[PDB]
Amino acid sequence: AVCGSVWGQNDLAYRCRTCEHDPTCAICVPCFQNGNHKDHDYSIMYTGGGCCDCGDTTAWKREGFCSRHK
Ligand SMILES: [Zn+2]
Ligand SMILES: [Zn+2]
Ligand SMILES: [Zn+2]
Numbered sequence: 001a002v003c004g005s006v007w008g009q010n011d012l013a014y015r016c017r018t019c020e021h022d023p024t025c026a027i028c029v030p031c032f033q034n035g036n037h038k039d040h041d042y043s044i045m046y047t048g049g050g051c052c053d054c055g056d057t058t059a060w061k062r063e064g065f066c067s068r069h070k
Contacts (some may be wrong), residue, residue, distance in 0.1 A: 003031050003052035003069050013050060017041035019064030020053075027060065028052040034066035 005028040007013055014032040015025070018040035026047045027035075031054035053059035055069030062070070 001069065002055035003028060003066075005031070005052040005054075007047075007049055009049045010046065011049070012044050013047050013052075015043050015045060015047070016064060019061045021059055021061070025053045025059045026050050027054045027064075027066075031066040031069065034068055035064055037064065040064075 007028060013026045013028055015023075016027070016032070016037055018037065019025075019042075029044070031052055032042070035054070054066050
């Protein structure tokens with residue numbers, strides 16, 4: 001249902017300003033790759049570590065969920 005990926009400080013992840021509900025939101029690289037963000041305002045970057053928001057309706061717009069957590 002909600003991605004259980006976690007990553008550390010020096011691990012890349014994705015922000016998407018089109019899909020996020022808060023600037024602190026982020027999704028893991030595989031969730032980004034398996035979703036649809038063309039023409040979105042997204043950036044690969046470091047986030048200080050985190051837990052993936054893919055699948056969480058409180059953190060991420062449903063249209064931005066990957067195929068595996070939709
Ligand atoms: Zn997006
Ligand atoms: Zn994920
Ligand atoms: Zn996902």
